[PDB]
Design an enzyme around this catalytic site. Structure first.
Site, mmCIF file in Angstrom:
data_model
loop_
_atom_site.group_PDB
_atom_site.id
_atom_site.type_symbol
_atom_site.label_atom_id
_atom_site.label_comp_id
_atom_site.label_asym_id
_atom_site.label_seq_id
_atom_site.Cartn_x
_atom_site.Cartn_y
_atom_site.Cartn_z
ATOM 1 N N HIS A 36 4.202 2.941 0.558
ATOM 2 C CA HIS A 36 4.060 2.191 -0.689
ATOM 3 C C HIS A 36 2.647 1.614 -0.758
ATOM 4 C CE1 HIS A 36 5.636 -0.962 -3.744
ATOM 5 N NE2 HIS A 36 4.341 -1.165 -3.587
ATOM 6 N N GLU A 37 2.227 0.929 0.292
ATOM 7 C CA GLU A 37 0.893 0.348 0.318
ATOM 8 C C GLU A 37 -0.247 1.372 0.280
ATOM 9 O OE1 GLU A 37 0.254 -2.654 -0.320
ATOM 10 O OE2 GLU A 37 2.383 -3.141 -0.405
ATOM 11 N N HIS A 49 -1.520 2.268 -3.098
ATOM 12 C CA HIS A 49 -2.467 1.313 -3.687
ATOM 13 C C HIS A 49 -3.908 1.589 -3.285
ATOM 14 C CE1 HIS A 49 0.454 -1.124 -5.672
ATOM 15 N NE2 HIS A 49 1.090 -1.415 -4.552
ATOM 16 N N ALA A 61 -6.624 2.537 -6.190
ATOM 17 C CA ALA A 61 -7.860 1.766 -6.318
ATOM 18 C C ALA A 61 -9.115 2.590 -6.047
ATOM 19 C CB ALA A 61 -7.816 0.564 -5.391
ATOM 20 N N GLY A 100 -13.591 0.708 -11.245
ATOM 21 C CA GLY A 100 -13.796 -0.735 -11.156
ATOM 22 C C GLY A 100 -12.831 -1.330 -10.151
ATOM 23 N N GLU A 129 3.063 -0.696 -9.324
ATOM 24 C CA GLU A 129 4.230 -0.822 -8.461
ATOM 25 C C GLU A 129 5.172 0.384 -8.592
ATOM 26 O OE1 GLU A 129 2.956 -2.397 -6.570
ATOM 27 O OE2 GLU A 129 4.103 -4.212 -6.121
HETATM 28 ZN ZN LIG Z 1 2.931 -2.413 -4.480
#
Ligand SMILES: [Zn+2]
Length: 671
Positions: free
Chosen positions: A407-408, A411, A415, A421, A439
């Site tokens: 999950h992490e 991210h 990003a 940005g 999410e």
């Molecule tokens: Zn998350």
């Protein structure tokens, strides 16, 4: 019965005080409200002086059973000074000189043989005294008479501290005396205070409590209080270095426990960061040493661009699994997004650091060391290109370390490769837009596999099994958030829905975000949300996902990844891959890791005449997954380590399908 405020004004002090003595504080109407009626009551200097004198006689007499109405007396006088603070009408109560009239009443309670803590009365008597001092005032003599209570509390600490009542009593007593004092010398010189230098017995009483050493889970806070307030009261001891020395010992006593951080905070914030020796203590080095303690082991992958700093109790097997899992999630992401070139040059995410504490217990200290939230399962800070988590038992969390790592990791990818940005800052945040998406697609991509694309997660479908009537978000309701906990699961539901039933929209979404085309993304959210049929289509999908729960799985990294695969000539693997996936113009880089070596092989695939971007994508997937499965049928164990994706879709001058293709696997040939 209930007693009104306009009533009491029309009474004798004699009847009033005996009345207050019998009643409980809560019976009086608007006791803390400022009214025309409450003005006349507290406006009479004689009226309040009576209540104090009644408290002083009441304090001289009280026993283990008989309260003598002290709780009620305190709260009434407390209500006075409260109103005297906020209202210009009762300004004489705000004056510190008048509050000193309460002191002989406090001393009366103190000189009484029943001042020790024991019964429910005596416990709440100390409670009400401390709460009073905060609002009123105390002097050195009042403070030093608390020592018999703190000595008693410390002597029977293991019994008393875990008790709420007895505990709160001592806390409120100290909390209150500090409150009055800290306001009393607000910006004045702390040496000008009438108590300064005479508080030695109380100051030394906090040492003993704070430096108890032999503490347990139930009694740590009590010693914590001791240290915190030892610092704050240590500003009233002439020997400055004596106090700092005691704080330094508190660091060394519970080194890398809660109190250690508190003690260090006390030296930097109250004593400017200058130690007992007279030179500046290194706050940064301490935090660094604290981190090394909790994260002793280091594991380095992909030429030192993937570093896991982990606790001494997290399996090497897990570390390895987490590496390989990142590769599974990565490839799915780049497939859907159609980009693998990082968006910006020389960012902090050029090297991903992953810090994994041993337990949730040990994870809590992360907030002290790295100053990030801990009220979470994990956390990715993009400007640091670092994400934090902890190993967990099944009983601590329903999600395993790999699952949350996945999950992490999403991210990190979002990003880096998707949202131009910094994260949370940009056009896609000026208004609420990607809350469900970030999410949502995270929980989704955490379902990545090696050869089966992206699959539903049993536990997330688990969550979806709950009352259908309402609760189940609308398509429009998920797209637009402030709502409740289930947002992650219906946000996922939207992501999977599009992935499975409507890939074109899902691709168009990602392309918009990639090209930072706000007006496009919004048009897509518009068309989805304004469409009743698309919601019906979505509402049905949720049911299918719920239906899949029984025979659902938790996509994790295979044990095949950990097997010792053996040597195969590096040239052989590349040729065999290049031939299999029909790649032309290929390069390859190799990369050293902790436990093994790895290769990333790039190339260009160019197929037959196109069937349209979205049919092409669908076929490419089936094509590429098949190439991965067939390659795994070869006797080399290391073919089961392969992960592959395709980016940068286009068609040639002759309409022939064209992609860039990437392969990543283990390498057993050295150099
Ligand atoms: Zn998350």
């Amino acid at each position: 019965t209930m007693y009104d405020f306009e009533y009491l004004n029309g009474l004798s002090y004699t009847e009033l005080t005996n009345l207050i003595k019998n009643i409980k504080w809560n019976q009086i109407n608007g006791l803390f409200n400022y009214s025309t009626g409450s003005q006349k009551f507290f406006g009479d200097k004689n009226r309040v002086q009576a209540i104090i004198n009644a408290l002083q006689e009441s304090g001289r007499t009280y026993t283990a059973n008989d309260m003598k109405g002290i709780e009620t007396f305190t709260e009434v006088l407390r209500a006075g000074f409260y109103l005297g603070y906020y209202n210009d009408g009762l300004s004489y109560l705000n004056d510190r000189n008048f509050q000193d009239k309460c002191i002989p009443a406090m001393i009366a309670i103190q000189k009484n043989p029943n001042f020790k803590l024991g019964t429910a009365v005596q416990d709440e008597v100390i409670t009400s005294l401390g709460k009073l001092i905060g609002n009123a005032s105390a002097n050195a003599e009042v403070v030093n008479n608390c020592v018999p209570v703190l000595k008693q509390f410390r002597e029977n600490l293991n019994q008393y501290a875990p008790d709420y009542v007895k505990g709160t009593a001592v806390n409120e007593l100290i909390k209150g005396i500090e409150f009055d004092f800290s306001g009393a010398a607000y910006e004045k010189d702390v040496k000008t205070m009438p108590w300064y230098g005479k508080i030695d017995p109380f100051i030394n009483e906090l040492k003993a409590l704070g430096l108890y050493g032999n503490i347990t889970s139930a009694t740590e806070w009590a010693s914590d209080v001791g240290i915190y307030y030892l610092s704050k009261f240590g500003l009233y001891s002439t020997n400055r270095n004596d106090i700092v020395q005691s704080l330094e010992k508190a660091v060394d006593m519970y080194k890398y426990g809660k109190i250690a951080f508190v003690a260090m905070e006390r030296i930097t914030w109250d004593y400017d960061g200058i130690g007992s020796n007279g030179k500046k203590v290194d706050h940064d080095k301490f935090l660094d040493d604290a981190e090394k303690h909790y994260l002793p082991k280091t594991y380095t992958f992909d030429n030192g661009t993937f570093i896991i700093r982990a606790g001494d109790k997290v399996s090497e097997e897990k570390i390895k699994r987490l590496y390989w899992a990142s590769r599974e999630v990565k490839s799915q992401f780049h497939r859907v997004v159609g980009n693998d070139k990082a968006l910006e040059v020389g960012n902090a995410d050029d090297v991903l650091t992953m810090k994994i504490f041993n337990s949730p217990e040990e994870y809590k200290f992360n907030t002290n060391i790295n100053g990030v939230s801990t009220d979470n399962g994990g956390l990715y800070i993009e400007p640091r290109g670092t994400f934090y988590t902890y190993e967990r038992t099944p009983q601590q969390s329903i999600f395993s370390l790999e699952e949350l790592f996945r999950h992490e990791y999403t991210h990190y990818l979002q990003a880096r490769y998707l949202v131009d940005g910094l994260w949370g800052q940009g056009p896609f945040y000026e208004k609420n837009r990607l809350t469900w998406f970030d999410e949502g697609t995270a929980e989704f991509f955490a379902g990545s596999t090696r050869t089966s694309g992206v699959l539903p997660r049993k536990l997330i479908l688990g969550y979806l099994a709950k009352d259908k009537v309402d609760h189940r978000y609308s398509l429009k309701k998920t797209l637009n958030s402030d709502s409740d906990w289930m947002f992650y699961n219906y946000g996922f539901a939207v992501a999977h829905y599009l992935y499975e039933k409507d890939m074109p929209t899902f691709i168009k979404m990602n392309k918009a975000i990639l090209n930072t085309d706000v007006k496009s993304y919004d048009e897509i959210i518009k068309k989805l949300s304004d469409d009743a049929n698309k919601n019906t289509e979505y509402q049905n999908h949720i049911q299918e996902l719920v239906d899949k729960y029984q025979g659902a799985g938790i996509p994790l990294v295979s044990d095949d990844y950990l097997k010792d695969h053996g040597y195969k000539k590096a040239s052989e693997v590349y040729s065999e891959i290049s031939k299999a996936a029909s790649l032309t113009n290929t390069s390859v880089t190799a990369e050293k890791s902790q436990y093994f070596n790895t290769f990333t092989l790039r190339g260009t695939y160019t197929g037959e005449t196109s069937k349209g971007e979205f049919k092409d994508w669908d076929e490419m997937s089936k094509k590429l997954d098949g190439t991965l499965e067939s390659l795994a049928k070869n006797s080399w164990s290391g073919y089961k380590t392969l992960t592959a994706y395709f980016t940068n879709y286009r068609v040639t001058s002759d309409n022939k399908v064209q992609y860039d293709v990437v392969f990543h696997g283990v390498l057993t040939d050295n150099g």
